UniProtKB/Swiss-Prot annotation, chain D:
Superkingdom to which the source organism belongs: Bacteria
Biological processes per GO annotation: protein refolding
Keyword rRNA processing: no
GO molecular function, one term: isomerase activity
Keywords: ATP-binding, Chaperone, Cytoplasm, Isomerase, Nucleotide-binding
Primary localization: cytoplasm
Record keyword Ribonucleoprotein present: no
Organism field: Escherichia coli (strain UTI89 / UPEC)
One annotated Gene Ontology cellular component of this protein: cytoplasm
Residues of the full protein shown: 412 to 526 of 548
Name of the protein described by the UniProt record: Chaperonin GroEL
Subcellular location: Cytoplasm
């Protein structure tokens, strides 16, 4: 189709305008005195939310160029929330700040490529300063504290998370489910988690978490690329009886197969979800068997001459629950017999002895850690279904935060960490003046979050920011109480992972837009 | 009347657009391969010129704001031509360059006041480097050389100027008049010059020199402020009868008096020109008498009770010619008797002996030096009236240039001097980053003249400019021959006073416009 | 007032469009098969003419920029007609050709200044080739022939001019007046001519010749610059009585004085014309006296303390007629007494003996040559007033042509001389490629006249032009008879001065316009 | 051959005396030789340096001497590791000239209406 092409400043201003609509819409929710955004549905009453992720999802602009701008920031900003479970809004606010001053510089005559390098250098330096400022989170006392803070000052949640990590470890897999009653429950069952997400966002049945949940599903394990639905009919019909969901773990699912599964599942004829098999090559084949042994199913390998048409319900494995998001898939409580699993774990441990390479042993040690490690299940209890679902949400959110805290620690929240690091990089310089400007652009951008939070509170941002710079360490401004002091002590903090991710992703998109000279899109026609 | 008010960038862009029209029209004539500008003169066929001063005079824009911009640069740029007799076009090109980059910086967020200070610092430093680069012009050989170059390689003119300065000295008064025949003539006649210009630019009858020339005029000497024309009627009627011009030397001429003289003179009923009396206070009264004794007139002092109504032709003094520009007044060949002048000279010499103060003696020494000094007159000869007028013009122009060369010397022309000084100020810095930008704005602007000259020649400016910076001293590019070398030796040079004035004035207006936040003018109605 | 400014190509295209209107309108009359142009008159029926000068004078465009273009070409093209009495149309066609291809080159990326230099070099070379191709015109037989050809093959006119030049010389002053009867007459009266034209084109009363004629006028001689009309009143009133015209010969006439004279004369209040005094400085003073002695008037010198208010009719000189054009002024039959004139001639001859310098002698010899030389007067006779005026016109035109022929000779006409010279400069080159283009632009432009003439005839220009180049010398195409041969022999020729001036002026303006980057004019 | 668009500007510099059968063909030659500077000039432009200056300096050298846009240093391009298969540069130029030659010699175009 005929395209509309724009260049230089004309394109960059369009891109910026789009990012402003996105940022200006999400940044109203930032801080403890954040405002509400009303999202229309028409299929009912409008939604009122302070969740910047919810707002961002809805943002799409009519102007094709402006839209491209907003969609580029959204994409990258969302990755921050996927990594640490928070920071999408922060990343968006940072991106806006970097792009705004960045383009101003480009217009002044600065070299875009140098500006980018200046920014990137300021960021790498900022991340290093974040590590220095970071406070560890190791002992269970700390884990409980971070969990409590992340749970809106609920000591219960903090305790639950602490106990859960004490069973499966810090690197262990932890899941959250609905409670059976008032009492909370914690059990460790046979399960596994691998880094593979849904193959289509249309499988999502829990839009709130943006994940796919399957109750008592069958699991198909095929070591082939499924492209046609013809070979699936016999298995789909067998799953259509007994009325249970189906998880397809194959080398890949594409073409007609994927499409048909996407449609049929949305029509509600058969609940199905598909994900790629973990790893690649020989390792993929081996891990598919790990899943098989764990779920008590048999792998349908065309390599040995098996067909998918000859696949019976007996060939399918099964578990109690499956949780699939954009990046990970979690199998909970496999039907695999303890004898069979322990048997394969011992088999792999034998392979660790015969291992010649260190690499080979580390990869095997990873597979045994999954199979033997299991999965922790937290059943959140309450009086009332409403209270139960609500608490469950806080537990899931607090869990993600705590995990991130155990990885890289915690730093002052309220956007203090960023303005602190920025203040320590005043003497940072580059190879030329253009890069120097890029550095200053980034350092001034790191004040955006704090200033926005203060603004929402109705206080003078410049004054607060100026005072916070005066102090050192995790000294900052508690926007909630309007008191200065140690942010960590006051309980206002963020996982170092969150702040880091937000900044790095923000700078990623910002750097790309600053170095854009041409945009191509379709015509309004 | 109702006013139209603009602020900030809105105002500055309007101002800039106006300066561009001015600059872009004048800078096409810059250099030896300068282009022609066609100026329409409805009364007759159009004028074709390469004189940037002629072009500038005609520039007036429809948009009131844009016009204000062009008129501000015109006013200040003309002052460079009034001081050194050249550099108006160079100043205009510089002004454009400083304003353009200056406003770009302001839009970037730079502090206007700091930009100005940065610019001014770069200029003061540039002027000092210009002094260092300057080559003196003292000996008559050099004076003849500079005069020849300024006369378009006419050795005759160089000689004439050299001889004239050898009679009256380097600080001597030299005038140029029409020749009586083929032979050139040099004589010293009774005359004086004082630092007072026309009271209205509407007295100008010689627009190219931008001066007022009166042939065999009467001179009125009144020690009072003339505000009404009623008191002038009897004198104006007496002057209307001898069919001769009138120059009025009074304390001041304002109000109706000035207006009536402006109109009546433009109508051509009676040629009249007015200037203030030289000096102030008691000294003014004394110098008015010097003029009286010299012109053979009587001064009409209201202090003793004399009135302007009883002023007869006998009270008025007279000379052969009077030349008046924006700054100076020159009376040539007064009718005063030798006995009367020598009488007052001896009288003042008596006051030098009674002088108690050094200051008082120096002021008296100045008035005797004028009365006794006289004026040197160069009569330019030729074979034709056309050739005579033409040569006379080159002599007048070469005279101004040579005088300026004797004051501050000469530097490389073709805009080399500017790019040379700029290259020596790379390490110049200010108090903050904003000032640093201001410095770089000015240094980059100093390349405008050269680059423009090269552009008119059809060569790559960036390459030539780059090569010129590579050299040192008065090494540059001769745009005429396309050869590099010593500019002074090749005969391409400019009085150090010209280049200096052009830059300082250019920076003056540029600095004012950069620090403008509001503009007020009338409505299009 | 606010101005409208244009730059670069935007300005040059406007300028070109204006030149095309001018050129396209005038070039239709070029050649023996030239077309008519109808010029509208506010009062009366329209004028039908083949005179490109008449057409040019009427051309003025509504677009201010386009107009500037047309007026620039007009101004310079007219100078060619002032110099040789012909070639304004030719200059206009050349200008068009040079500008058209010139701008095309500029747009191609060629350097305007180099293009100009290339053109100028081609012209200087072309002028030299014109001199070489030129055929002298010295003997009376030749003078009569050139005069006859310029008079539309009238042997009578050729003879008249020949006789006239035989009396006063080749550098003599010759005038033409109305005849008193059928017989032509030729007499030499005391008169003088100096190189000073009218100070305002509004003094023109004979628009055909573009000159000013005054019958039995008074002559005011003042050695001062007249700027006010106050000092003229007493003299103007005295001239208003006796109802005769007034010629003002002063150092200069400007400001109110000039304006008032311009208006009063166009209102018919009193017929007045003003010109500057000849020469400058001391020489000017001396020549004013020559005119005084010749016209029998007195010079009003303010230097000795004379005033213009005390000027009587007795102080004014008088002649039988005065002819003033843009460049020259001619005083015919002064009332000065023979004793007074012969007296001053002898006085000047005495100054020649006391002359130390050669320059001084030459200048004195020039003044005596005017006073003693006199002026030849040709009274054109005919049977009817209509035939008399008609013949008089042909005599005046043929006279100018013959004069120009005696100065620089004659070359082939019909635009052959230009195309001939062009063909001999094929190997001419410049300092760079841009200059080379400039040269070719000029050489190709020199074919414009011939091609236009052939076009008006309805023949293929490229074919004729191609054939003419094939020959040599004054071999060309007679557009009238459609036969090739020696142009001079066939009687188709132009004064070398005409063709030269036309080309040089054409290239002058063309060069200026090609090197124009800005234009300034008033708003609509 | 040297990369960074040096090879093209180098070859072009060695063909200054190349002439054709008439002036028009001579212009065509100059058009091509000036066009071979496009790649380098563009690369330099993207780097934020003066193309005319760099191009001018590269012509000054000989062989595979050029400008390393990355490091801003001049020298042997092959040694510095900036190069392109001779087949690439050749193909790029020949195909570029192919279409360019066809469009220059186009007098008519036929296409459907906006409907
Ligand atoms: Mg979260
Ligand atoms: Mg004629």
């Amino acid at each position: 189709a005929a395209k509309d092409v724009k260049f230089g400043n004309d394109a960059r201003v369009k891109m910026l305008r789009g990012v402003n609509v996105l940022a200006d819409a999400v940044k109203v929710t930032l801080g403890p005195k954040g405002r509400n955004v009303v999202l229309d549905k028409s299929f009912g009453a409008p939604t009122i939310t302070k969740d910047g992720v919810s707002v961002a999802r809805e943002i799409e602009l009519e102007d094709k160029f402006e839209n491209m701008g907003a969609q580029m920031v959204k994409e990258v900003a969302s990755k921050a929330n996927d990594a640490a479970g928070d920071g999408t809004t922060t990343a968006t606010v940072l991106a806006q700040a970097i792009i705004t001053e960045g383009l101003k510089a480009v217009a002044a005559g600065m070299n875009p490529m140098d500006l980018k390098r200046g920014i990137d250098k300021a960021v790498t330096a900022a991340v290093e300063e974040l590590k220095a400022l970071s406070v560890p989170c190791s002992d269970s006392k700390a884990i409980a504290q971070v969990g409590t803070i992340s749970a809106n000052s609920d000591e219960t949640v903090g305790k639950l998370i602490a106990e859960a990590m004490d069973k499966v470890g810090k690197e262990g897999v932890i899941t959250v489910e609905d409670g059976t009653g008032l009492q909370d429950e914690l059990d460790v069952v046979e399960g596994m988690q691998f880094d593979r997400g849904y193959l289509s966002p249309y499988f999502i049945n829990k839009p709130e978490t943006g994940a796919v949940e399957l109750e008592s599903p069958f699991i198909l394990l095929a070591d082939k690329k499924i492209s046609n639905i013809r070979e699936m009919l016999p298995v789909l019909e067998a799953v259509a009886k007994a009325g249970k969901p189906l998880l397809i773990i194959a080398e890949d699912v594409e073409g007609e197969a994927l499409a048909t599964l996407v449609v049929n599942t949305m029509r509600g004829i058969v609940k199905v979800a598909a994900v790629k098999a973990p790893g690649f090559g020989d390792r993929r084949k081996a891990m598919l068997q790990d899943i098989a042994t764990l779920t008590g199913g048999t792998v349908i390998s065309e390599e040995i001459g098996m067909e998918l048409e000859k696949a019976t319900l007996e060939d399918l494995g099964q578990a109690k629950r499956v949780v699939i998001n954009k990046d990970t898939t979690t199998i909970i409580d496999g039907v695999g017999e303890e004898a069979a699993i322990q048997g394969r774990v011992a088999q792999i441990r034998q392979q660790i002895e015969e291992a010649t390479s260190d690499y080979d042993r580390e990869k095997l040690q990873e597979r045994v850690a999954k199979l033997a490690g299991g999965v922790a299940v937290i059943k959140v209890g309450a009086a009332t279904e409403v209270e139960m679902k609500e608490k469950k949400a806080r537990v899931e959110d607090a869990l993600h935060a705590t995990r991130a805290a155990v990885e890289e620690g915690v730093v002052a929240g309220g956007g203090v960490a960023l303005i602190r690091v920025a203040s320590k990089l005043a003497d940072l310089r580059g190879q030329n003046e253009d890069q120097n400007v890029g550095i200053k652009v980034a350092l001034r951008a790191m004040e955006a979050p704090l200033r926005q939070i203060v603004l929402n509170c109705g206080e003078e941002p410049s004054v607060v920011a100026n005072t916070v710079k005066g102090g050192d360490g995790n000294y900052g401004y508690n926007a909630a109480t309007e008191e200065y002091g140690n942010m960590i002590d006051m309980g206002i903090l963020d996982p170092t992972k969150v702040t880091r991710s937000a900044l790095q992703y923000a700078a990623s998109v910002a750097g790309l837009m600053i170095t854009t000279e041409c945009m191509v899109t379709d015509l309004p026609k």
